[PDB]
């Protein structure tokens, strides 16, 4: 909220929420109710465009630093699926095997590439439509992005990078060269095989609020390239070696909440209450629980001291395993042939 | 030749030159004798390798800022053909359409890409063997280079780039990102479809001395990647916005020497002599004239004053048009099918 000012994003008022629901014909995701996606840039443009019968596209991404996604990383992906189902628009997903090899001394491109492909399985396991979704790694799609990477780079000073991402002269040049790579897919030109070279297809970018810098930068260069400014919709972080992965079994999950999940309850049972703003388990349930009436009542009871830290952690565990089990079976149905449909660069479509 | 030592280069020795002629059965190309290629880094390593029956490869390049190559730009290319004929080794040639779009405000990728393809025709017109030569533009081969680009970038600080190329914070980030692109082909890993993934094939890089910075940098990162240091052999530039292009007609050529070619002769005929170190026409004939006996005698007569500036400029004109006519007919034999042979990324070969 102090970060929303210094970035210069606007809050998503109810009037926007009511408009999307109004235009879509579907109930708003709970990530809106609960201010999980709380922030945007020019999201009102997207609804303007969709109001006019015009199509647009979604862009989101993932950095493969681990073989499996955290559950926290499903927050933007699950939300994007909802947006794809609601607007029925194409989606574009970048796996940044280049970035994480660059920004993490303890990594190689062989590992990042493999982690990328496993990560795709977790991503597809969220139930995206392959007829509407194009997924790709930077190592494999770099040539298609290169022309827009070069155009963005020519318009930004090295000093502007420092100013935006806070790098220093001591940083490796790879760090300076990546932002353009992440910026590039927010322009329709970077996907000739779906949009046909058109430059007039608006892009909407769901992302954790910490990714905002890349898209602040690209919104500044857009006009100088005669391109549309991409719109953004921001989520808050999902708070914290080992945190909860989507391929964790029931025992792993229970083990981690009980030992590593910071409680807001009193040390002993001096609960005739608890602090919900610091309780990690409460904040997790806010993302997961589709039942509103349960949530308020859990929050009330755990606040007032008629629920111990022990019980709130158990409720979360069973929610996490329901989530993680449903994702794990969906993942079993994902083979190289299913991947191929998502990775297939060509889409015989009529946007031209 | 004090900067040339300071940089860390070595002058090419008669021993080194004799050592070669001994080892190939061919008399030495005159760019050696005339000290046009005067300098090297670990060229003695290449001869060591060739002494042992082992193969290596050549890497040279061209920046397409103009539709036609200057005659000066044929100096490294003509020399490389000689090296290819003498050692019978594979060659790899990079057209940097990315660089010149990056470094020249008055350029676009469309122009640079086209200028690249016309430039290839001039390059192929030097008589390279397509069974031994692989030519490519960065826009088209970037994905194959990307892994080594990324590996070089992770090992160099932004401050190291400033220090080596003299860039400033005000410079666009594209300028910082390009050196790795030019470095990458000096490692055999960057050509899996000829060397088979092998990292133990030495590379030799012919270049104008002003390109040295890129290969100073890449020689410093080689060990940290477990890669071989590339060797280089360096040429002095053809003495210098119109200069002589390979597609210039006779009239264009005569027009340029007479008007723009700095003479070392006296203003009027106060020649009972001339200064050969400043005379641009004399220095051009040193590169061109395959006849030694003529050259000494021209130099003597033009020195002593029994040849006017007028005649020396005419001799050069007729040499230039003989050169430029032979190149122009060889260029007429170059179609997209010929280009395709050179640009074809795959080479069924036994280096593995
Ligand atoms: N940089 C993001 C991955 C990513 C790539 N493109 C994106 C677009 C939007 C949000 C995130 C991304 C990460 O570290 O995981
Ligand atoms: N950047 C170089 C072209 C080049 C690329 N790779 C090279 C290797 C050797 C010599 C030249 C090159 C130029 O503008 O001239």
Q: Which of A243, A170, A184, A238 is nearest to A210 (CA)?
A: A238
- Which residues of A fall within a CB distance of 8 Å from B172? 153-158
d(CA A261, CA A283): 11
Where a domain ends, among A193, A224, A240?
A240
Same domain, A309 and A192: no
- The torsion defined by the Cα of A202, A206, A210 and A216, in degrees rounded to 10, comes to 10
Statement to judge: residues A95 and A215 lie in one domain: yes
The DSSP call for residue B229 is: P
Q: Which ligand is nearest to the CA of B233?
A: 2
Residues lining ligand 1, judged by CB closer than 6 Å?
Answer: A 59-63, 94, 96, 99, 182, 205, 207, 211
Contact flag A154-B98 (C-beta cutoff 8 Å): no
> Are B79 and B213 within one domain?
yes
The stretches of chain A forming alpha helices (DSSP H) are 2-7, 14-24, 30-33, 43-51, 74-87, 97-103, 109-124, 138-153, 158-165, 173-177, 179-183, 192-195, 212-221, 250-260, 280-288, 292-304, 309-332, 336-343
Residues A117 and A168 in one domain: yes
Strand partners, A204: A58, A231
Instruction: Give the pairing type, strands A10-11 and A37-41.
Output: antiparallel
A76 with A135, same domain: the answer is yes
Discontinuities after residues in chain A (C–N over 2.5 A):
240, 272
Question: Residue B221 carries which DSSP code?
Answer: H
Same domain, B252 and B112: no
Q: Find the CATH number of the domain harbouring B61.
A: 3.40.50.620
Structural contact between residues A24 and A87, judged by C-beta atoms closer than 8 angstroms:
yes
Closest among A233, A180, A176, A184 to A204, alpha carbons compared: A233
> Is B314 found in the same domain as B229?
no
Element (H, E) at A268: none
Tokens of B345: 């990324």
Yes or no, beta carbons of A153 and B159 under 8 Å apart: no
* Alpha carbons within 13 A on the beta-carbon side of A320: 29
Same domain, B258 and B183: no
What is the C-alpha separation between A6 and B348, in angstroms, rounded?
58
If you write DSSP's letter for every residue of A66-98 in order, what string do you get?
SSS-BSTTHHHHHHHHHHHHHH---EEEEE-HH
Closest CA to A342 of A84, A24, A108, A36: A84
Residues B179/B61, Cβ–Cβ less than 8 Å: no
Give the residue from B219, B240, B261 where a domain finishes.
Answer: B240
B209 and B40 in contact (C-beta within 8 Å)?
no
Q: Which residue of A has its CA nearest to B152?
A: A174
The protein residue with its alpha carbon nearest to ligand 1, atom 1, reads A63
Sheet of B231-235, strands arranged across: B10-11, B37-41, B231-235, B203-208, B57-62, B91-95, B133-137
Are B349 and B308 part of one and the same domain?
yes
Quick one: CA torsion of A219, A223, A229, A234, rounded to 10 degrees?
10
Q: How many folded domains does chain A comprise?
A: 2
How is residue B41 written in tokens? 């880094």
What is the CB-side half-sphere exposure of residue A159 using CA atoms within 13 A? 5
Of B124, B44, B58, B45, which Cα lies nearest the Cα of B88? B58
| φ/ψ bin of B53: left (φ > 0), alpha (ψ from -120 to 50), beta (otherwise) | left
Q: How far is the CA of B244 from the centre of ligand 2 (A)?
A: 19
Looking at the structure, tell me whether residues B234 and B254 fall in a common domain: no
Dihedral of alpha carbons B46, B51, B54, B57, sign: positive
State both tokens at B273: 């002599």
Spatial distance between the Cα atoms of A33 and A20, rounded to a whole number of angstroms = 13
Q: Which residues of B33-57 are buried (b: 16+ CB within 10 A; e: fewer)?
A: eeebbbbbbbbbbbbebbeeeeebb
Nearest CA to ligand 2 atom 6: B61
Say yes or no: A190 and A143 in one domain: yes
Residue-number span of the structural domain to which B21 is assigned: 1-240
Gap from CA of B271 to ligand 1 centroid (Å) = 74
Give CA–CA dist B348/A67, Å, rounded: 36
Q: What are the residues whose beta carbons fall under 8 Å from the beta carbon of A226, sequence distance 6 or more?
A: A199
B225 and B311 share a domain? no
Distance CA B244, CA B258 (A): 12
Identify the bridge partners of residue A263 per DSSP, sorted by sequence position: none
φ/ψ of residue B95, rounded to 5: -95, 115
How was it solved?
X-ray
Which residues are registered as beta bridge partners of B87? none
Helices (H), chain B: 3-6, 14-24, 30-33, 43-51, 74-87, 97-103, 109-124, 138-155, 158-165, 173-183, 192-195, 212-221, 250-260, 280-288, 292-304, 309-332, 336-343
- Residues forming a β-bridge with A231: A204
Exposure string of A242-265, with b = 16+ CB inside 10 Å and e = fewer, is eebbbebeeeebbebbeeebebbb
- Shortest CA distance to B271 belongs to which of B280, B260, B279, B261? B279
What's the gap in Å between A331 CA and the centre of ligand 1? 22
Listed residues B224, B240, B256: the one ending a domain = B240
Task: Give me the CATH number covering residue B267.
Answer: 1.10.240.10
A104 token code pair: 């993490």
Separation of CA A237 and ligand 1 centre (Å): 13
Strand partners, A6: none
Which residue has its alpha carbon closest to ligand 1 atom 7? Answer: A61
Of B98, B147, B169, the CB nearest to A139: B147
Cβ contact A40:A17 at 8 Å: no
Cα separation, B69 vs B244, in Å, equals 9
């Amino acid at each position: 909220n102090k970060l929303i000012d210094k970035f210069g994003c606007k809050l998503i008022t109810k009037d926007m929420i009511e408009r999307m629901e109004r235009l879509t014909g579907q109930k708003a995701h709970h990530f809106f109710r609960r201010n999980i996606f709380l922030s945007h840039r020019d999201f009102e443009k997207i609804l303007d465009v969709y109001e006019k019968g015009e199509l647009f596209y979604l862009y989101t991404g993932r950095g493969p630093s681990s073989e499996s996604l955290h559950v926290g990383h499903l927050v933007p992906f699950l939300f994007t699926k909802y947006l794809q189902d609601t607007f029925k628009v194409p989606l574009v997903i970048q796996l940044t095997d280049d970035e994480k090899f660059i920004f993490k001394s303890n990594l190689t491109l062989e590992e990042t590439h493999n982690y990328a492909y496993e990560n795709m399985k977790d991503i597809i396991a969220c139930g995206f439509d392959p007829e509407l979704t194009f997924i790709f790694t930077n190592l494999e799609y770099i040539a298609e992005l290169y022309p827009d990477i070069l155009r963005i780079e020519k318009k930004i000073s090295c000093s502007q990078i420092k100013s935006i991402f806070g790098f220093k002269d001591s940083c490796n040049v790879g760090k300076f060269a990546f932002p353009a790579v992440q910026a590039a897919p927010a322009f329709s030109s970077s996907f000739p095989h779906i949009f046909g070279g058109r430059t007039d297809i608006h892009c909407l970018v769901p992302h954790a609020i910490d990714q905002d810098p890349y898209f602040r930068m690209v919104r500044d260069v857009a006009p100088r390239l005669g391109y549309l400014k991409p719109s953004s919709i921001h989520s808050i972080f999902l708070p914290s070696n080992s945190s909860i992965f989507v391929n964790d079994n029931e025992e792993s999950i229970r083990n981690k909440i009980m030992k590593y999940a910071f409680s807001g309850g009193q040390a002993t049972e001096e609960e005739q209450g608890a602090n919900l703003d610091v309780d990690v388990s409460w904040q997790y349930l806010r993302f997961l629980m589709e039942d509103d009436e349960k949530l308020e009542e859990i929050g009330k009871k755990y606040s007032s001291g008629e629920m111990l830290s022990g019980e709130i952690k158990s409720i979360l565990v069973q929610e996490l395993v329901k989530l993680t089990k449903n994702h794990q079976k969906n993942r079993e149905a994902i083979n190289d042939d299913v991947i191929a449909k998502f990775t297939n660069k060509s889409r015989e479509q009529l946007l031209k």
